[PDB]
Write a protein that binds this DNA or RNA. Structure first.
Lengths: 197, 200
DNA sequence: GCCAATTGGC
DNA sequence: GCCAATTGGC
């Protein structure tokens, strides 16, 4: 099964003048390929209820009338890309945020909600992602964060995120204003697709 | 490393408790550190200069906003909620305080839907981990260089407590749940028993 | 200049 | 059930 992408279908989406977002872009480029996109995938929805808490903690917290054995508490990624042959999955997030850009003061980029995406660096979620998605190669992280909005052109935010990721520079992508869906797909195609093999 | 050489001032903390004064992380640690080699910093400045000189490829520079300032002397960084330094060894533990509501008695489950506490996870990025270990001096692999103290109803929320427990995996001592009504002693005991030795 | 942490959205 | 990501605050 070739891993070639459907650039013709993507060009049609672009030509249809339709506003491109991550979903219609990957949906178009994956048509007839061995890849499929999921919006709000459910693979990681059953992680927390089964967590074993010391009896000392149980006594100190609120214990609702609930059957934890059948309770599914977990996370809901913005999206996931699956190679339907190997069934390996890359889970992703989309962080949209304003930023300090031309004509604005630094305060326009003072927001910090994007830090929330760093929950993916916790050892527990890294372990869960690797187990469920199948990407065990230590060379890359098992998630992909796509940033959107003026934060992607903010001199401070861009350097901050670059600093955070350190040697995992391909695990995030800055999808800048007015940029084509093609560049978003090229990042996946050139830097991440091989890890689903 | 004798126990006496690092004994905390438990009597000063008991005095604070006996005074009836409202306890918070700062007055609790300031009291317990009285006369010792440890000092607590509120908003430490050790990590004030981190990002401005980060190198960006020419093809990225071309696509971003480049302000007309001198990045070589610009200080962009972070400001931890607190830090604990052993002034004899100069090793430092950096900390955060995350207060948040939660699903507890008398509340609808929606009271625990909040997720801003996730921001604290920035400390797990490889970049900040390296910066924290370099500055604070803690390279022991079995412990992380930071300590996140949670406060508020989130500390008793059945889903949030399990979520955070899960996140931390085998680094359970790198966070502490300071519950409503809990005194300062429990907070200090966590540091004393699980983290203080990493400042030796 | 940097962090708080919430209420509304899907 | 779980995520969006902002504006207020010092």
């Amino acid at each position: 099964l070739s891993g070639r992408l459907n650039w013709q279908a993507l060009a049609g989406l672009k030509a249809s003048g339709a506003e491109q977002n991550l979903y219609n872009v990957f949906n178009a480029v994956f048509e007839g390929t061995k890849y499929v996109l999921y919006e709000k995938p459910k693979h990681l929805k059953n992680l927390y209820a089964q967590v074993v808490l010391p009896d000392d903690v149980i006594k100190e917290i609120f214990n609702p009338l609930i059957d934890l054995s059948t309770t599914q508490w977990g996370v809901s990624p913005a999206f996931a890309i699956e190679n339907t042959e190997t069934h390996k999955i890359l889970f992703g997030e989309i962080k949209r945020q304003d930023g300090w850009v031309e004509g604005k003061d630094p305060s326009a980029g003072r927001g910090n909600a994007h830090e929330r995406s760093c929950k993916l660096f916790t050892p527990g979620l890294l372990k869960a992602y690797r187990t469920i998605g199948g990407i065990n190669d230590e060379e890359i992280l098992p998630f992909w964060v796509v940033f959107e909005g003026d934060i992607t052109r903010d001199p401070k935010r861009v350097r901050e995120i670059t600093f955070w990721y350190d040697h995992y520079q391909d695990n995030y992508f800055m999808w800048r204003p007015n940029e084509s869906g093609e560049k978003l797909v090229q990042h996946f195609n050139e830097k991440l697709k091989k890890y689903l093999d």
